[PDB]
mmCIF file of all heavy atoms in Angstrom:
data_model
loop_
_atom_site.group_PDB
_atom_site.id
_atom_site.type_symbol
_atom_site.label_atom_id
_atom_site.label_comp_id
_atom_site.label_asym_id
_atom_site.label_seq_id
_atom_site.Cartn_x
_atom_site.Cartn_y
_atom_site.Cartn_z
ATOM 1 N N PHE A 1 -21.949 -46.380 5.804
ATOM 2 C CA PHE A 1 -21.759 -47.344 6.845
ATOM 3 C C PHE A 1 -20.978 -48.559 6.505
ATOM 4 O O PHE A 1 -21.358 -49.254 5.563
ATOM 5 C CB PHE A 1 -23.132 -47.722 7.465
ATOM 6 C CG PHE A 1 -23.077 -48.616 8.712
ATOM 7 C CD1 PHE A 1 -22.377 -48.174 9.842
ATOM 8 C CD2 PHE A 1 -23.742 -49.838 8.844
ATOM 9 C CE1 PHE A 1 -22.314 -48.959 11.087
ATOM 10 C CE2 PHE A 1 -23.725 -50.690 10.002
ATOM 11 C CZ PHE A 1 -23.088 -50.200 11.134
ATOM 12 N N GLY A 2 -19.841 -48.787 7.196
ATOM 13 C CA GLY A 2 -19.135 -50.045 6.856
ATOM 14 C C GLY A 2 -18.048 -49.963 5.826
ATOM 15 O O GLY A 2 -18.276 -49.901 4.643
ATOM 16 N N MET A 3 -16.744 -50.038 6.220
ATOM 17 C CA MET A 3 -15.735 -49.932 5.268
ATOM 18 C C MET A 3 -14.459 -50.557 5.936
ATOM 19 O O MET A 3 -14.395 -50.674 7.120
ATOM 20 C CB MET A 3 -15.257 -48.375 5.134
ATOM 21 C CG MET A 3 -16.123 -47.506 4.240
ATOM 22 S SD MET A 3 -15.424 -45.807 3.982
ATOM 23 C CE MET A 3 -15.914 -45.702 2.209
ATOM 24 N N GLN A 4 -13.427 -50.880 5.131
ATOM 25 C CA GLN A 4 -12.285 -51.525 5.644
ATOM 26 C C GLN A 4 -11.156 -51.167 4.650
ATOM 27 O O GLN A 4 -11.336 -51.281 3.446
ATOM 28 C CB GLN A 4 -12.508 -53.040 5.647
ATOM 29 C CG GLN A 4 -11.367 -53.849 6.208
ATOM 30 C CD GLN A 4 -11.681 -55.314 6.360
ATOM 31 O OE1 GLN A 4 -11.555 -56.068 5.593
ATOM 32 N NE2 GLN A 4 -12.186 -55.574 7.681
ATOM 33 N N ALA A 5 -9.934 -51.201 5.178
ATOM 34 C CA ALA A 5 -8.741 -51.006 4.354
ATOM 35 C C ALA A 5 -7.644 -51.682 5.084
ATOM 36 O O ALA A 5 -7.636 -51.718 6.311
ATOM 37 C CB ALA A 5 -8.342 -49.500 4.206
ATOM 38 N N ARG A 6 -6.655 -52.145 4.409
ATOM 39 C CA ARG A 6 -5.453 -52.869 4.968
ATOM 40 C C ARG A 6 -4.198 -52.149 4.600
ATOM 41 O O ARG A 6 -3.988 -51.879 3.341
ATOM 42 C CB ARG A 6 -5.477 -54.323 4.346
ATOM 43 C CG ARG A 6 -4.221 -55.141 4.699
ATOM 44 C CD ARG A 6 -4.130 -56.566 3.950
ATOM 45 N NE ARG A 6 -5.356 -57.252 4.103
ATOM 46 C CZ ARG A 6 -5.632 -58.077 5.119
ATOM 47 N NH1 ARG A 6 -4.635 -58.500 5.934
ATOM 48 N NH2 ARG A 6 -6.856 -58.567 5.275
ATOM 49 N N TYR A 7 -3.298 -51.888 5.465
ATOM 50 C CA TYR A 7 -2.059 -51.216 5.179
ATOM 51 C C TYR A 7 -0.876 -52.156 5.689
ATOM 52 O O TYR A 7 -0.792 -52.562 6.868
ATOM 53 C CB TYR A 7 -1.914 -49.945 5.939
ATOM 54 C CG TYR A 7 -2.963 -49.025 5.478
ATOM 55 C CD1 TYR A 7 -4.227 -48.940 6.166
ATOM 56 C CD2 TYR A 7 -2.713 -48.140 4.371
ATOM 57 C CE1 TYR A 7 -5.279 -48.046 5.684
ATOM 58 C CE2 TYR A 7 -3.732 -47.311 3.917
ATOM 59 C CZ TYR A 7 -4.901 -47.241 4.559
ATOM 60 O OH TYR A 7 -5.872 -46.393 4.023
ATOM 61 N N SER A 8 -0.018 -52.577 4.781
ATOM 62 C CA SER A 8 1.075 -53.390 5.147
ATOM 63 C C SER A 8 1.916 -52.623 6.049
ATOM 64 O O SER A 8 2.162 -51.449 5.847
ATOM 65 C CB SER A 8 1.889 -53.843 3.926
ATOM 66 O OG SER A 8 3.173 -54.230 4.405
ATOM 67 N N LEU A 9 2.476 -53.205 7.198
ATOM 68 C CA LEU A 9 3.434 -52.664 7.952
ATOM 69 C C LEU A 9 4.786 -53.257 7.645
ATOM 70 O O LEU A 9 5.741 -53.026 8.399
ATOM 71 C CB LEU A 9 3.107 -52.892 9.474
ATOM 72 C CG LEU A 9 1.695 -52.587 9.938
ATOM 73 C CD1 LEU A 9 1.450 -52.855 11.426
ATOM 74 C CD2 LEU A 9 1.536 -50.987 9.745
ATOM 75 N N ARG A 10 5.011 -53.899 6.580
ATOM 76 C CA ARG A 10 6.258 -54.640 6.323
ATOM 77 C C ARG A 10 7.231 -53.810 5.641
ATOM 78 O O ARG A 10 7.106 -53.488 4.419
ATOM 79 C CB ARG A 10 6.046 -55.931 5.497
ATOM 80 C CG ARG A 10 5.215 -56.974 6.214
ATOM 81 C CD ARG A 10 4.722 -58.116 5.241
ATOM 82 N NE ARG A 10 3.618 -58.802 5.928
ATOM 83 C CZ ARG A 10 2.331 -58.499 5.834
ATOM 84 N NH1 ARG A 10 1.968 -57.433 5.171
ATOM 85 N NH2 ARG A 10 1.480 -59.247 6.383
ATOM 86 N N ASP A 11 8.245 -53.333 6.382
ATOM 87 C CA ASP A 11 9.321 -52.545 5.772
ATOM 88 C C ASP A 11 8.781 -51.149 5.332
ATOM 89 O O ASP A 11 9.508 -50.458 4.563
ATOM 90 C CB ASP A 11 10.002 -53.274 4.651
ATOM 91 C CG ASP A 11 10.894 -54.464 5.267
ATOM 92 O OD1 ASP A 11 11.808 -54.155 5.977
ATOM 93 O OD2 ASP A 11 10.586 -55.626 4.858
ATOM 94 N N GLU A 12 7.616 -50.724 5.700
ATOM 95 C CA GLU A 12 7.081 -49.414 5.530
ATOM 96 C C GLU A 12 6.009 -48.994 6.649
ATOM 97 O O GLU A 12 5.665 -49.823 7.486
ATOM 98 C CB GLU A 12 6.431 -49.212 4.146
ATOM 99 C CG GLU A 12 5.077 -50.002 3.927
ATOM 100 C CD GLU A 12 4.614 -49.908 2.525
ATOM 101 O OE1 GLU A 12 5.356 -49.660 1.607
ATOM 102 O OE2 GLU A 12 3.433 -50.164 2.285
ATOM 103 N N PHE A 13 5.642 -47.730 6.716
ATOM 104 C CA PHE A 13 4.854 -47.211 7.748
ATOM 105 C C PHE A 13 3.754 -46.240 7.266
ATOM 106 O O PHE A 13 4.106 -45.241 6.603
ATOM 107 C CB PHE A 13 5.680 -46.539 8.912
ATOM 108 C CG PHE A 13 4.885 -46.178 10.066
ATOM 109 C CD1 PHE A 13 4.734 -47.056 11.099
ATOM 110 C CD2 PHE A 13 4.235 -44.910 10.051
ATOM 111 C CE1 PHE A 13 3.989 -46.638 12.237
ATOM 112 C CE2 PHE A 13 3.477 -44.558 11.205
ATOM 113 C CZ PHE A 13 3.317 -45.451 12.255
ATOM 114 N N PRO A 14 2.486 -46.566 7.484
ATOM 115 C CA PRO A 14 1.376 -45.841 6.766
ATOM 116 C C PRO A 14 1.174 -44.436 7.330
ATOM 117 O O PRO A 14 0.054 -44.168 7.795
ATOM 118 C CB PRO A 14 0.195 -46.816 6.907
ATOM 119 C CG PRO A 14 0.412 -47.527 8.244
ATOM 120 C CD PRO A 14 1.866 -47.380 8.560
ATOM 121 N N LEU A 15 2.238 -43.617 7.285
ATOM 122 C CA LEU A 15 1.966 -42.154 7.562
ATOM 123 C C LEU A 15 1.549 -41.517 6.266
ATOM 124 O O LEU A 15 2.330 -41.422 5.351
ATOM 125 C CB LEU A 15 3.254 -41.511 8.031
ATOM 126 C CG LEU A 15 3.150 -40.244 8.876
ATOM 127 C CD1 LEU A 15 2.134 -40.239 9.940
ATOM 128 C CD2 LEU A 15 4.573 -39.799 9.495
ATOM 129 N N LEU A 16 0.283 -41.193 6.162
ATOM 130 C CA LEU A 16 -0.197 -40.725 4.793
ATOM 131 C C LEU A 16 0.616 -39.658 4.156
ATOM 132 O O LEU A 16 1.208 -38.693 4.868
ATOM 133 C CB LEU A 16 -1.645 -40.264 4.955
ATOM 134 C CG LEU A 16 -2.778 -41.249 5.301
ATOM 135 C CD1 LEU A 16 -4.101 -40.598 4.861
ATOM 136 C CD2 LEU A 16 -2.620 -42.709 4.667
ATOM 137 N N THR A 17 0.750 -39.750 2.838
ATOM 138 C CA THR A 17 1.585 -38.733 2.023
ATOM 139 C C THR A 17 0.738 -37.719 1.275
ATOM 140 O O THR A 17 1.386 -36.695 0.813
ATOM 141 C CB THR A 17 2.524 -39.544 1.102
ATOM 142 O OG1 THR A 17 1.720 -40.144 0.047
ATOM 143 C CG2 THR A 17 3.359 -40.606 1.868
ATOM 144 N N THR A 18 -0.566 -37.858 1.166
ATOM 145 C CA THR A 18 -1.252 -36.816 0.306
ATOM 146 C C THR A 18 -1.569 -35.500 1.076
ATOM 147 O O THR A 18 -2.061 -34.598 0.505
ATOM 148 C CB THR A 18 -2.492 -37.374 -0.324
ATOM 149 O OG1 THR A 18 -3.424 -37.834 0.677
ATOM 150 C CG2 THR A 18 -2.050 -38.465 -1.351
ATOM 151 N N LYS A 19 -1.235 -35.437 2.381
ATOM 152 C CA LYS A 19 -1.157 -34.332 3.174
ATOM 153 C C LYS A 19 -0.153 -34.676 4.271
ATOM 154 O O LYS A 19 -0.022 -35.879 4.584
ATOM 155 C CB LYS A 19 -2.462 -33.846 3.777
ATOM 156 C CG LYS A 19 -2.944 -34.904 4.790
ATOM 157 C CD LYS A 19 -4.246 -34.617 5.398
ATOM 158 C CE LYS A 19 -4.531 -35.292 6.686
ATOM 159 N NZ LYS A 19 -5.840 -34.833 7.210
ATOM 160 N N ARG A 20 0.528 -33.631 4.851
ATOM 161 C CA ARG A 20 1.376 -33.861 5.955
ATOM 162 C C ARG A 20 0.620 -34.226 7.258
ATOM 163 O O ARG A 20 -0.341 -33.472 7.566
ATOM 164 C CB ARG A 20 2.202 -32.658 6.244
ATOM 165 C CG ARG A 20 3.367 -32.804 7.300
ATOM 166 C CD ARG A 20 4.424 -31.662 7.223
ATOM 167 N NE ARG A 20 5.820 -32.113 7.153
ATOM 168 C CZ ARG A 20 6.496 -32.289 5.988
ATOM 169 N NH1 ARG A 20 5.969 -31.972 4.837
ATOM 170 N NH2 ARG A 20 7.752 -32.763 6.017
ATOM 171 N N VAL A 21 0.882 -35.418 7.876
ATOM 172 C CA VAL A 21 0.248 -35.761 9.088
ATOM 173 C C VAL A 21 1.054 -35.360 10.267
ATOM 174 O O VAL A 21 2.297 -35.528 10.261
ATOM 175 C CB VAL A 21 -0.151 -37.261 9.152
ATOM 176 C CG1 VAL A 21 -0.860 -37.658 10.505
ATOM 177 C CG2 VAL A 21 -0.964 -37.640 8.041
ATOM 178 N N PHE A 22 0.467 -34.784 11.298
ATOM 179 C CA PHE A 22 1.204 -34.376 12.561
ATOM 180 C C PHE A 22 1.789 -35.613 13.391
ATOM 181 O O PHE A 22 1.301 -35.949 14.474
ATOM 182 C CB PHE A 22 0.239 -33.416 13.358
ATOM 183 C CG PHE A 22 0.827 -32.828 14.552
ATOM 184 C CD1 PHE A 22 2.170 -32.640 14.653
ATOM 185 C CD2 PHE A 22 0.062 -32.452 15.635
ATOM 186 C CE1 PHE A 22 2.722 -32.088 15.789
ATOM 187 C CE2 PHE A 22 0.545 -31.837 16.718
ATOM 188 C CZ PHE A 22 1.951 -31.682 16.838
ATOM 189 N N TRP A 23 2.864 -36.169 12.844
ATOM 190 C CA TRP A 23 3.528 -37.291 13.364
ATOM 191 C C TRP A 23 3.875 -37.196 14.820
ATOM 192 O O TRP A 23 3.518 -38.031 15.696
ATOM 193 C CB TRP A 23 4.808 -37.545 12.526
ATOM 194 C CG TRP A 23 5.696 -38.466 13.309
ATOM 195 C CD1 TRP A 23 6.982 -38.235 13.818
ATOM 196 C CD2 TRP A 23 5.408 -39.831 13.669
ATOM 197 N NE1 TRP A 23 7.419 -39.318 14.447
ATOM 198 C CE2 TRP A 23 6.521 -40.369 14.410
ATOM 199 C CE3 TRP A 23 4.280 -40.620 13.475
ATOM 200 C CZ2 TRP A 23 6.523 -41.582 14.866
ATOM 201 C CZ3 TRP A 23 4.255 -41.956 13.869
ATOM 202 C CH2 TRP A 23 5.345 -42.438 14.598
ATOM 203 N N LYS A 24 4.521 -36.078 15.239
ATOM 204 C CA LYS A 24 4.943 -35.816 16.617
ATOM 205 C C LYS A 24 3.741 -35.770 17.509
ATOM 206 O O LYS A 24 3.817 -36.285 18.726
ATOM 207 C CB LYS A 24 5.718 -34.490 16.757
ATOM 208 N N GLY A 25 2.644 -35.259 17.078
ATOM 209 C CA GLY A 25 1.458 -35.349 17.884
ATOM 210 C C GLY A 25 0.941 -36.754 18.076
ATOM 211 O O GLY A 25 0.370 -37.148 19.113
ATOM 212 N N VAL A 26 1.235 -37.549 17.126
ATOM 213 C CA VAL A 26 0.709 -38.991 17.094
ATOM 214 C C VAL A 26 1.436 -39.780 18.160
ATOM 215 O O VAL A 26 0.761 -40.381 19.058
ATOM 216 C CB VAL A 26 0.878 -39.526 15.724
ATOM 217 C CG1 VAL A 26 0.655 -41.174 15.788
ATOM 218 C CG2 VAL A 26 -0.148 -38.945 14.751
ATOM 219 N N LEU A 27 2.678 -39.732 18.142
ATOM 220 C CA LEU A 27 3.631 -40.312 19.114
ATOM 221 C C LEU A 27 3.407 -39.809 20.607
ATOM 222 O O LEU A 27 3.130 -40.694 21.400
ATOM 223 C CB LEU A 27 5.093 -39.884 18.696
ATOM 224 C CG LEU A 27 6.213 -40.472 19.489
ATOM 225 C CD1 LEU A 27 6.140 -41.988 19.574
ATOM 226 C CD2 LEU A 27 7.453 -40.158 18.763
ATOM 227 N N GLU A 28 3.350 -38.592 20.760
ATOM 228 C CA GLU A 28 3.137 -37.974 22.159
ATOM 229 C C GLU A 28 1.766 -38.384 22.617
ATOM 230 O O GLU A 28 1.640 -38.623 23.887
ATOM 231 C CB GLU A 28 3.203 -36.468 22.090
ATOM 232 C CG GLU A 28 4.486 -35.849 22.887
ATOM 233 C CD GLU A 28 5.864 -36.102 22.231
ATOM 234 O OE1 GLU A 28 5.892 -36.637 21.073
ATOM 235 O OE2 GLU A 28 6.911 -35.812 22.801
ATOM 236 N N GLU A 29 0.784 -38.440 21.827
ATOM 237 C CA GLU A 29 -0.570 -38.703 22.460
ATOM 238 C C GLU A 29 -0.567 -40.212 22.808
ATOM 239 O O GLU A 29 -1.178 -40.550 23.823
ATOM 240 C CB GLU A 29 -1.706 -38.311 21.460
ATOM 241 C CG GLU A 29 -3.033 -39.015 21.857
ATOM 242 C CD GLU A 29 -4.263 -38.645 20.971
ATOM 243 O OE1 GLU A 29 -4.767 -37.490 21.149
ATOM 244 O OE2 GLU A 29 -4.777 -39.436 20.154
ATOM 245 N N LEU A 30 0.142 -41.068 22.040
ATOM 246 C CA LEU A 30 0.183 -42.541 22.264
ATOM 247 C C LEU A 30 0.987 -42.814 23.608
ATOM 248 O O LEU A 30 0.502 -43.521 24.358
ATOM 249 C CB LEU A 30 0.718 -43.279 21.058
ATOM 250 C CG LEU A 30 0.641 -44.852 20.987
ATOM 251 C CD1 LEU A 30 -0.629 -45.437 21.239
ATOM 252 C CD2 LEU A 30 1.309 -45.516 19.892
ATOM 253 N N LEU A 31 2.113 -42.116 23.753
ATOM 254 C CA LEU A 31 2.892 -42.271 25.005
ATOM 255 C C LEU A 31 2.093 -41.854 26.295
ATOM 256 O O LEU A 31 1.976 -42.574 27.268
ATOM 257 C CB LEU A 31 4.200 -41.503 24.936
ATOM 258 C CG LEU A 31 4.988 -42.170 23.776
ATOM 259 C CD1 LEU A 31 6.219 -41.368 23.445
ATOM 260 C CD2 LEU A 31 5.453 -43.655 24.148
ATOM 261 N N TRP A 32 1.271 -40.760 26.211
ATOM 262 C CA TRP A 32 0.426 -40.305 27.229
ATOM 263 C C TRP A 32 -0.712 -41.385 27.414
ATOM 264 O O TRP A 32 -1.082 -41.680 28.550
ATOM 265 C CB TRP A 32 -0.159 -38.950 26.752
ATOM 266 C CG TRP A 32 -1.105 -38.253 27.760
ATOM 267 C CD1 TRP A 32 -0.717 -37.585 28.770
ATOM 268 C CD2 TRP A 32 -2.595 -38.121 27.681
ATOM 269 N NE1 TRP A 32 -1.867 -37.042 29.523
ATOM 270 C CE2 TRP A 32 -2.993 -37.369 28.796
ATOM 271 C CE3 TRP A 32 -3.555 -38.572 26.744
ATOM 272 C CZ2 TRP A 32 -4.275 -37.033 28.996
ATOM 273 C CZ3 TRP A 32 -4.844 -38.245 26.984
ATOM 274 C CH2 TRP A 32 -5.272 -37.515 28.155
ATOM 275 N N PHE A 33 -1.196 -41.936 26.366
ATOM 276 C CA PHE A 33 -2.206 -43.024 26.467
ATOM 277 C C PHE A 33 -1.592 -44.221 27.205
ATOM 278 O O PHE A 33 -2.175 -44.747 28.111
ATOM 279 C CB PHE A 33 -2.741 -43.360 25.021
ATOM 280 C CG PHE A 33 -4.180 -42.933 24.815
ATOM 281 C CD1 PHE A 33 -4.400 -41.655 24.330
ATOM 282 C CD2 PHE A 33 -5.239 -43.797 24.998
ATOM 283 C CE1 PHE A 33 -5.715 -41.264 24.086
ATOM 284 C CE2 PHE A 33 -6.608 -43.468 24.748
ATOM 285 C CZ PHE A 33 -6.789 -42.145 24.210
#
Protein backbone atom coordinates (compact mmCIF):
# COMPACT_ATOMS: atom_id res chain seq x y z
CA PHE A 1 0.00 0.00 0.00
CA GLY A 2 1.40 3.36 -1.01
CA MET A 3 4.12 4.11 -3.54
CA GLN A 4 5.30 6.92 -5.74
CA ALA A 5 7.70 7.49 -8.65
CA ARG A 6 8.65 10.55 -10.65
CA TYR A 7 9.52 10.55 -14.38
CA SER A 8 10.99 13.63 -15.98
CA LEU A 9 9.20 14.74 -19.08
CA ARG A 10 12.02 17.10 -20.08
CA ASP A 11 13.34 16.22 -23.52
CA GLU A 12 12.26 12.55 -23.01
CA PHE A 13 9.04 10.50 -22.75
CA PRO A 14 8.53 7.67 -20.21
CA LEU A 15 7.42 4.92 -22.66
CA LEU A 16 8.90 1.97 -20.74
CA THR A 17 11.81 0.17 -22.41
CA THR A 18 12.02 -3.18 -20.51
CA LYS A 19 9.11 -4.47 -22.55
CA ARG A 20 7.41 -3.02 -25.60
CA VAL A 21 4.39 -0.86 -24.58
CA PHE A 22 1.40 -0.65 -26.94
CA TRP A 23 1.96 3.07 -27.80
CA LYS A 24 -0.74 3.28 -30.49
CA GLY A 25 -3.31 1.90 -28.12
CA VAL A 26 -2.25 4.50 -25.59
CA LEU A 27 -2.81 7.39 -28.00
CA GLU A 28 -6.08 6.13 -29.43
CA GLU A 29 -7.66 5.41 -26.08
CA LEU A 30 -6.66 8.94 -24.86
CA LEU A 31 -8.22 10.61 -27.98
CA TRP A 32 -11.42 8.61 -27.42
CA PHE A 33 -11.30 9.73 -23.76
